[PDB]
């Protein structure tokens, strides 16, 4: 849903998460592991990008007399050139790093989706909007096992094949 | 049948940032790095006594221009304020060599 | 802080906001 479809305003405990819907109802739940890694990385990124800019001690301006006009224009050029250089660096890195930040978030979405997919290959059928419909019943315990990386595929493989082969 | 879905977060934030591929990208969370509020507050820095020469040029203050006696005894500062157009400078016409040094 | 010529330097910490 990075651009596939929309986000979730009801999920307010993390960047990324799941929306589960079973017999016991529905609800949002953030994935703390991937959200935590993303916070770690974006924090280190912002701090590195900002803190990398340290400059030497400078009393900037200079005024040169009527016999030092060449001396003068050179100093104004140096001042304004350091201006241009630091401005150029800040602008480019802000643009590039906002790009890379959005793309990093997209890749985190993709990785979470692929994890949930690899856990449930034939026990669930993919719904095209980043969803899965179970051929079996995934109770709260099953949902949590999917969420903390410990889904049991042989546990439900029997019921899922039965319901799958009948559905199809 | 049951469904288990995956998605990311949304809020009511309208913070827009620019990327090279796309401008005015509304993000959920951002940080402004640019302070752009010269506040009416213009004061000293470390509670010092920043001294204004008033209508005296730097040369007029250093040489001792007679109309610049409001500056005598002004001993310490965090910086010095000079108008672009003071009235009392080098009164007898002349120059202070290396004025700028 | 550093003087620059930019008029806006807010950096994205989060991902795009897409309601609904």
């Amino acid at each position, epitope marked *: 849903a990075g651009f596939i479809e929309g986000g979730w305003t*009801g999920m307010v*405990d993390g960047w990324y998460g799941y929306h589960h819907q079973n017999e016991q109802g529905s609800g949002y*739940a953030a994935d703390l592991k991937s959200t935590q890694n993303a916070i770690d990385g974006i924090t280190n990124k912002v701090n590195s990008v900002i803190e990398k800019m340290n400059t030497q001690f400078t009393a900037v301006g200079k005024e040169f007399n009527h016999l030092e006009k060449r001396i003068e224009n050179l100093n104004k050029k140096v001042d304004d050139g350091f201006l241009d250089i630091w401005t150029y660096n800040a602008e480019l890195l802000v643009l590039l790093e906002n790009e890379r930040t959005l793309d990093y978030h997209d890749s985190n979405v993709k990785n979470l989706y692929e994890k949930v997919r690899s856990q449930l290959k034939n026990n669930a059928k993919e719904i095209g909007n980043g969803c899965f419909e179970f051929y079996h019943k995934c109770d709260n315990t099953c949902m949590e096992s999917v969420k903390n990386g410990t889904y049991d595929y042989p546990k439900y493989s029997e019921e899922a094949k039965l319901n799958r082969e009948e559905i199809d | 049948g049951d469904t288990l879905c995956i998605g990311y977060h949304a*809020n009511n934030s309208t913070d827009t940032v620019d990327t090279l591929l796309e401008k005015n990208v509304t993000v*959920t*969370h951002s940080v402004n790095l640019l302070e752009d509020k010269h506040n009416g507050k213009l004061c000293s820095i470390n509670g010092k006594q920043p001294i204004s020469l008033g209508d005296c040029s730097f040369a007029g203050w250093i040489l001792g221009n007679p109309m610049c006696d409001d500056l005598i005894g002004k001993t310490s500062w965090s910086y010095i304020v000079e108008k672009p157009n003071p009235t009392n400078g080098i009164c007898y016409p002349g120059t202070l060599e290396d004025e700028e040094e | 802080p550093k003087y620059v010529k930019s008029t806006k330097l807010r950096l994205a910490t989060g991902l795009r906001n897409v309601p609904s």
Partner: antibody
Amino acid sequence: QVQLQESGPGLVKPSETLSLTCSVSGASISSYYWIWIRQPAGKGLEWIGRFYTSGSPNYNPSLRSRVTMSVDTSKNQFSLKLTSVTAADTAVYYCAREEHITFGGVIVRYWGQGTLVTVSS
Amino acid sequence: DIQMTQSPATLSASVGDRVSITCRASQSISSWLAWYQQKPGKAPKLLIYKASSLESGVPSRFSGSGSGSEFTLTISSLQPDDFAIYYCQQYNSYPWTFGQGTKVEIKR
């Protein structure tokens, strides 16, 4: 402001069900997580757990088997219910609001005033 | 899961003295701690989150430093009103765990 007040009968009998109600003013509960935390007098603080109206609760393991958290959006409250309160369960209870996502992770800024629950015959 | 050693239990230091409270952790937690000031018989007041994010309105004398498993709450100038019990919470993994708390008193 968001303000969290706390009501607890106190003096729950040693094999009964504690029922605690945190009342919420200045915030629609349906769009916030709600947390319960506890303190055995001079002892440290303990996180009881988390609950949401459109979400999934998570509780502390030591109390997991016994805790149930509910939310009344009608009366703007949320309640703990702890089965078979032990002598060790006598402590001060606090209710807090789980703020939304921040760049420094999730914050609990807003805190209840604390009510004493004593377990005695 | 995450046991907490917050040293030392009891401190007394005169006004203006710097104070440092160490909050050792059982596992890796990155920098995800909180520091709370619980005044006597009152709700705990969150001093620091992110271990380095001074909550708005908190006096700038408070500073949180660390990442990983070791962390330190440092009061630059101890003041009378800073008499309380100081806890360190962890929000990297449930269950959230507090330290035993450190009682800061004042030599006078």
